[PDB]
Design a protein around this ligand. Structure first.
Ligand code: NAP
Ligand code: NAP
Ligand code: NAP
Ligand code: NAP
Ligand code: GDR
Ligand code: GDR
Ligand code: GDR
Ligand code: GDR
Lengths: 362, 362, 362, 362
C-alpha cells in the first residue's frame, strides 16, 4: 500500500528536498513542524501547488525534538514505515551559545524517536534514518575520512550528534531495529540557511552586486570543506532505508574547497575577479578591476574550536548504493548565486513599486 | 547609564512592539531569539533601518526558554535592569498537541528567568514582567474578570501560564524581587500570528477579495473576546515595571465581540456585507449582495475544551496607571484588513512581474 | 480479571500504605521506582514477606517523573486500570532550593502520565488519581478550606502542584478521562520522611530520651496544621477511583494543631512535660521536671514564604464518600513515638554487640 | 585559603570514598545530594563522627543533574576549586529501561556543570573531573584498551558517557578550562550498589552461607572485567586534578577475571568450593562437597547488547601519575564477603532479639 514517511526538520533544507522526492515517489509524507510565531514553511509552500487538482499527500504536525510526549504522539498517530530524523539545531557556531538546547534537540531527540519506535512496538515496521554528519570527524584523524575513521568532535553540536550516531547504532545492535547513520559531508543549495558560510557568501555577493550591501565579513578563510548539493544527498537518505540490512554510509564528493575559493568562485558568477591581499585577520578580498574592497575578516565569526578540513571517502557508498554526485561544485555555486540575485531583485521590485521591505541581517 | 532591557519573545508580536517602544525611550534593548533554519526576524527587521546613522542599540542573543543554561548565560552577559518574559508557545490550540513542550516553555521558562535573577544576585537590580493572560480565567467564575477573579484554566497553555503567574507571585513574596503579572486580555495587530482567529480572518478576507482564495473555514463562531491593540498593551507592560511597588494588573478594553462579529466587521471593511444562515456546524456566512459563500464551519478548529467568553475589568489599572486604550476595535480591524490587502497585493505584483510566489497555509 | 494498579512514588509514605491496601484487595500492584545507588525500598520490603507461599503480586519498574519515555514505556508495559500519581519531590523547604527539578517532577510529571493515557488510547480503561494537597491553599483565603476555596500557592512546590491540579482537571474536562484530585491535608505515620516536622520531632524526642541526642532545633513553632494518619488517607485515594463520575475531594480531619502542640504531645508520650519560655526566635522548650533545655529555634528552618495555618472542611467527602477519620491525632503521635524509640533501640542493640552504627542527620 | 571541593554523586560508592579522602586532606567538602523520601546517606554518615569535637567540614546540598538551575545555584553558592562529576545513573542494565533519564543525567549533567563554570566566570579557578568509564570501549576495538583505543558504546549509558567524555574534551579545547576524563575501569568495594554483579554475588553468597537465601541467579557468566578497588581509584581522581595540564587517563589493574571466576573466588571465602556443570543458560554452579545448587542462569539478567570483555592498559597513568593498584583482586573479594557476612549477621541479631527486619531484594 501507500508508503508513509515521517520527516523531522521538514521545514529545513534537507527536509524540503526530501519531502519533494518522497511525494514524487508516491509517499504519504508527514512532517514534524515546530510551533512558530509566524509562517515558517517557505521552503515547502510550493509543494502544495496543485493545478491538476491531483492532490498533495503532505501533512504537517506540531511537535518538538525536546518533547517526548509530542514525538510519541506523532509517531503513534502517523504509524510511519520510514522515519527521517533531519530536525536539529544544526548550526555549529550557535551550539557554543546554546550547548544544552543543542544536546537536548540533537542528541536526546534521536533517542526519543528510537525509543518511541520501541515503546510502540514498531521495531519490525519502521526504518529509521539518523542525520549524522562529517562534523563527527572534527579534528580529523585520517585524511580522507571514511566510515572507520575515529571521531573527534570539536563543538557541542558534534558532541551531541556523536551521541545520536551511537544511540542509533545501539538500537540497531541491541534491538534489531533498522536504524542507520547517513554520515553526510557538507551539502548546500539555494535553500541553505542564510548564516551558514556558503549561503552567507552568495547572498552577500548578490546584494553587493546590486548595490544594496557594502561588504562581506567572514571568519576562517582557510577552512576546507567537501561541498555537495543537497538534492543529490537526500536521495541517498532515501536509498539507505531501502536496503536489505541497515548500514552506515559516508556520503561526500571526494573534493574539498576552501572558503576563500568559494568566495572567489561565487564572485566570478557576478563578474568580480577576486584579488586577495594580506594574511590572517588582515587578509582582504578586492575586485581586481575596480580595486573595491569586497571581503574582510571579522574574528567574531571564528569558532571557539575550529574544524579546519573535511574530505570524504565515499567508496563504500559508491560500491553498495551506486553513489555518484550528479551536481558539480561549480553548478552548485551558480545556482546559489542566481537564486540570491533573484531574491534581491524581488526586493528591489517591491521597493520600486512603493512597498517597503527591510532586509534581515545576521 | 543607559537603561538595559532583556526581552524574551522579541520576534513575536508584543516583543516587536515592545522593542520599538524601548528603543524610542533610549534603552539598550536585548532580545532572546531562537535558532531558526531561516531568518525569522521580519517583525523587527525594520528596527535596524538607520538612515541618520545614529545607531540602533538592539542586540539579539540565541537561547531557548527550555534551556536553563542559555537563559542564565544571557542574563549574566546582559545584566538587564528590566526583564520582559514575552517568549512563549502562545497558541491555545497547539497547546493541546504539545502540552509538555508548552509547559516546559511557558511555565518552567518563567521560573528559569526568575531563578537566574536569584542565583546571580540581581534581586535589587532587576525588575521582572511576566506575560500573564486572560486565559487564566478560562471557564470564567466572574463576569467581568478582575484581579481577584479566581482562575480556571481550560487548556494546557492556560495551566502552564497559571504556574508562571504563581511562581512570579511566589518569587515576589518569598524573595522581595520586583516581579509582577500583566494579566492582559486578547490584543491583536497587523503583526499577529496568522493562525490566531483575528489575523486568520483578515488574511482570508483580503485574499478572498483579491480572488486568490475561495473560502474561510472557522471553528466556534460564538466565542466572545475582549480585543485591544498590542501597541497600547505593550506600553502597560513597560509602565508596570516603573512603579514604586510590584503589583499585578488586568489590562483590557472592557468590551467583548464575537468571532462572528469580527468576520462581519472585517468583511465590511473590504466591501462585503455578511449574511449568516444556518445553525451550529451547518452555519454558513454569505455575501448578502452576491450570494457567494464566504465563511463555513469546520469542526477541526474546535478546541477540546473551549473558553467561551472573556471580558476584563481594568478598573485598578485605570486608577493606578491611567490605563485607557487609545486604539479602538474598529480601528484595529481596519488596520489589519489594510495590511493584509497590501501583503496580498505585494504577492500579485511578484507574480505579475514573472516571479513565483507560493503562499503558506495553516 | 485481576485489577492492575500503577503507583508512582511507591517507595514513599503513601505509596507503601497504598500498595499494602491494594495487595490486600487482590490487585496486581506495579510501582515506579527511581534508580538509586542503594536499596531504597525499606518502606515496602515487608510486603515481600510470604510465609504461606501464597505469592505477592508486587512489581517494581525503573522510571522517573522527569522522563516521558520511561513513563510511557511503563504505562505501555503495565496497561493499568488505575494510576496513582503519588511520586513527587514532596518537601516544601527543598522546593525553594530545587524549584525547577520540583516543577519538572511535580507539575510536568502528572502531565506526562495523563498524556501517556491519551496517546496510548487508554481513556476508557484507566482512571487517574492526582496527589493534590492542602498546600494549594497556601495563604488561606477562607477558614476552613474546602473544594471551592481559591488557591494561593506559597512555595515552588505548591505552584507546581497547582499546575498538576489543573492539568488533571483539564484532561477530565477536555478528553473525558476519569481523573480526579485528592486535595489531602497533611497526613503522617511512622513511615513519614525524617525531615518533615512531625517525624523530625518524634525522632529527636526518642533519641533525646535514650540519650543519643541533646537538643531538638525547629523553625516556626506557631505553624498550624490539620494532621491525619496516612493509613486512613490512602483508603480515600483508592475510593475516589471507584466512583461513577470523577470528582475532586478535600480529605482532612477538621481539627488543626500547632507545631508547639505536637512537641508538647509527643514529649508527653516519652514522659516529658514541656514548659515553654520566651518569644519568637528566643523561645525555648524545657523539661518541666528536670529543667533541661530540649527545644530551641533555629531560623535556618524558616521557609522563605510560610504557610501559617491549614484547616480542611471535608464535608463533601463525608457526604459523598463516607469519609470519617478512624485514627486520632493522639493515637498517631503515640504510634510515631513508639516506632522511633524502637528504631533507636535497634541501633543501641547493634552497638552493644560490637557492631558500629552511625545515625544520619538532616 | 582552604581548598573547596564539590562532589556530585557523593552518596554513591566513589563519592563516599572521595569525600573521606578529601576530608583527610583538609578540604571543605561539598556534595550534591538528591532529595530522597528517606535518609540515603548510609555510605557517608560515619564521616560526621567527631569524637574530639574537631569539626567535620562536609556540606550536603539538594540538587539534581537534570536541573540546570539547581546545579548553577550550588556552583554559585559553593564556588569550588575542584568539581568531581561522579553523579550518574550508573547502572548499565537500567539504562536500557530509562535511556532518556540516563542521557539527561549522565550526558547533559556534565555539560550543565561545565557550562556553569563558564557562565560564572570560573575557568581559571575551577578544575573539573569527569567520571568517564571503560564502558566507552564497549565492543572493544583493541585488546587491551588504552587512551587511544576508539570507542564503541554498547548501551544507552555508554552512549551518554561518550557524550560527557567529549563535551569535557571540548570545553578543555575550546575554552581552556582544566577539564579531564578519568577513564576508569570497573572498581568495586563493600559500598558497591547491591545490583552490580560483584556485590550481588558477595551479598547472595553471605546470605546463602548463613542460610537466609537459597539460590543466586546470574546472567552472562562469561563476561570478563578488569576489577580494582574503589579506594585506590578515587585517589587517582583527586590526583588527575593536581597536574600541570589537564589530560585523560585510563585507570585499570591490567588483569581481567570472568563473572564465573568471581563467584568461584567469593564462594571459596565462605567455605564453598564451586563446581560448574552445564553450558549456556543450562549452566549451573554446585557446591562440590554437598552437591547443592548454588548458582543458576536467568536470561532476564542478560543485557540487550553485551560488553563481553574489558581489559585496561594504564601504562600512561603509571608513567605520568605513578599509578599502581595497592589493593589486589583477592583482597577486594575477601573484604566484600566479610562485610556482607557482617551485615547479614546484624540482621539476624535484630531478629534474634525480637526485632523484625525484612531484607530487600532486587
Ligand atoms: N547541511 C549539511 O551540510 C549537513 C551535513 C551533515 C548533516 N546535516 C544534518 O542534517 C539535518 C538537515 O540539515 P539541514 O541543512 O536541513 O538543517 P536546517 O536547514 O538547519 O534544518 C533544521 C530543521 O530542524 C528543525 N528543528 C530545529 N530544532 C528543532 C526542534 N527542537 N524540534 C523540531 N524541529 C527542530 C528546524 O525547524 P525551523 O525551520 O523551525 O528552525 C528545521 O526544520 C540536520 O540534522 C543537520 O544537522 C547537515
Ligand atoms: N497576544 C495576546 O492577545 C496575548 C494575551 C495575553 C498574553 N499573551 C502572552 O504574551 C506573550 C506575547 O504574545 P505574542 O502575541 O507576542 O505571542 P507570539 O507572537 O506567538 O510570540 C511568541 C514569542 O516567543 C518565542 N518563543 C516561543 N517558544 C520559545 C522558546 N521555547 N524559547 C524561546 N522563545 C520562544 C517566539 O519565537 P519564534 O518567532 O521563533 O516562534 C516568539 O518570539 C506570549 O507569552 C503570550 O502567550 C498574549
Ligand atoms: N504526606 C502528606 O501529608 C501529603 C499531603 C498532601 C499531598 N501529599 C502528596 O502526596 C504524595 C505522597 O506523599 P508522601 O508523603 O508519600 O511523599 P514521599 O514520602 O516524599 O514520597 C515521594 C515519592 O516520590 C518518589 N519520587 C520523587 N521524585 C521522583 C521522580 N523524579 N521520579 C519518580 N519518583 C519520584 C520518591 O522516591 P524516593 O523514595 O527515591 O525518594 C517517593 O517514592 C506526594 O506527591 C505529596 O506531595 C502529601
Ligand atoms: N563503579 C565503577 O566501576 C565505575 C567505573 C567507571 C565509571 N564509573 C562512574 O563513576 C561514577 C561513580 O560510580 P559509583 O559506583 O559511585 O556509582 P553509584 O554508586 O551508582 O553513585 C551514583 C551517584 O550519583 C547520584 N545521582 C544519580 N542520579 C543523579 C541525579 N540525577 N542528580 C544528582 N545525583 C544523581 C546517586 O544518588 P543516590 O544515592 O540518590 O542514588 C549517587 O550518589 C558514576 O558516574 C559511574 O557511572 C563507575
Ligand atoms: C557538516 C556540517 O556543516 C554545517 O556546519 P557549520 O556550521 O560548520 O558550517 P558552515 O558552512 O556555517 O561553516 C563551514 C566553515 O566555514 C567557516 N566560516 C568562515 N567564515 C564564516 C562565516 O562568516 N560564517 C560561517 N557560518 N562559517 C564561516 C567556519 O569556520 C567553518 O569551518 C552544518 O550544516 C552542520 O549541521 C553539519 O553537520
Ligand atoms: C488571551 C490569549 O489569546 C490567544 O489565545 P487563543 O488561542 O484562544 O486565541 P485565538 O484568537 O486563536 O482564538 C480565540 C477564540 O476564537 C475561536 N476560534 C473560532 N474559530 C477559530 C479558528 O479557526 N482559529 C482560531 N485560532 N480560533 C478560532 C477559538 O475557539 C477561541 O475561543 C493567544 O494570544 C494566547 O497567547 C493568549 O493568552
Ligand atoms: C501538605 C503538605 O505537607 C507537607 O508539607 P511541608 O513541607 O509544609 O510539611 P512539614 O511537616 O515539613 O512542615 C509543616 C510546618 O512545620 C513548620 N516547621 C517548623 N519547624 C520545622 C522544621 O524543623 N522542619 C520542618 N520540615 N518544618 C518545620 C514548617 O514551617 C511548616 O509550616 C508535605 O507532605 C507536602 O508534600 C504536602 O503537600
Ligand atoms: C565500568 C562500568 O561498570 C558498571 O557497569 P555494569 O552495569 O556493566 O556492571 P555490572 O557489575 O552490573 O556487570 C558487569 C558484567 O556482569 C554481567 N552480569 C552477569 N550476570 C549479572 C547479573 O545478574 N547482574 C549484573 N549486574 N551483571 C551481571 C553483565 O552482563 C556485565 O557484562 C557500572 O559501575 C558502570 O557505571 C561503569 O561505567
Amino acid at each position: 500500500m501507500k508508503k508513509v514517511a515521517l520527516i523531522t526538520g521538514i521545514t529545513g533544507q534537507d527536509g524540503a528536498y526530501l519531502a519533494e522526492l518522497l511525494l514524487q515517489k508516491g509517499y504519504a509524507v508527514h512532517g514534524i513542524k515546530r510551533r512558530t510565531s509566524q509562517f515558517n514553511t517557505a521552503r515547502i509552500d510550493h509543494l502544495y501547488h496543485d493545478p491538476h487538482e491531483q492532490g498533495v499527500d503532505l501533512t504537517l504536525h506540531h511537535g518538538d525534538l525536546t518533547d517526548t510526549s509530542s514525538l510519541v504522539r506523532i509517531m503513534q498517530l502517523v504509524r510511519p514505515d520510514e522515519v527521517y530524523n533531519l530536525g536539529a539545531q544544526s548550526h555549529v557556531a550557535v551550539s557554543f551559545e546554546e550547548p544544552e538546547y543543542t544536546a537536548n534537540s540533537d542528541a536526546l531527540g534521536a533517542l526519543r524517536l528510537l525509543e518511541a519506535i520501541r515503546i510502540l512496538g514498531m521495531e519490525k515496521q519502521t526504518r529509521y534514518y539518523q542525520a549524522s554528519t562529517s562534523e563527527l570527524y572534527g579534528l580529523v584523524q585520517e585524511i580522507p575520512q571514511k566510515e572507520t575513521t575515529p571521531f573527534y568532535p570539536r563543538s557541542p553540536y558534534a558532541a551531541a550528534k556523536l551521541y545520536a550516531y551511537w544511540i542509533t547504532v545501539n538500537y540497531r545492535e541491541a534491538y534489531g531495529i533498522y536504524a542507520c547513520n547517513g554520515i553526510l559531508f557538507n551539502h548546500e543549495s539555494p535553500l541553505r540557511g542564510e548564516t551558514f558560510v556558503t549561503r552567507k557568501i552568495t547572498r552577500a555577493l548578490a546584494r553587493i552586486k546590486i548595490g544594496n550591501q557594502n561588504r562581506l565579513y567572514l571568519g576562517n578563510l582557510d577552512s576546507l570543506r567537501d561541498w555537495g548539493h543537497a538534492r543529490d544527498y537526500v536521495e541517498m537518505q532515501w536509498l539507505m532505508l531501502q536496503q536489505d540490512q541497515p548500514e552506515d554510509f559516508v556520503i561526500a564528493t571526494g573534493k574539498q574547497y576552501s572558503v576563500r575559493e568559494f568566495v572567489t568562485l561565487a564572485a566570478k558568477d557576478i563578474g568580480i575577479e577576486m584579488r586577495w591581499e594580506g594574511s590572517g585577520e588582515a587578509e582582504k578580498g578586492y575586485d581586481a578591476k575596480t580595486g573595491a574592497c569586497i571581503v574582510e575578516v571579522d574574528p567574531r565569526y571564528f569558532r571557539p574550536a575550529e574544524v579546519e578540513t573535511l574530505l570524504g571517502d565515499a567508496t563504500k557508498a559508491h560500491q553498495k548504493l551506486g553513489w555518484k554526485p550528479k551536481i558539480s561544485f561549480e553548478t552548485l555555486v551558480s545556482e546559489m548565486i542566481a537564486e540570491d540575485l533573484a531574491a534581491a531583485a524581488r526586493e528591489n521590485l517591491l521597493r520600486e513599486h512603493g512597498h517597503q521591505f527591510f532586509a534581515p541581517k545576521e
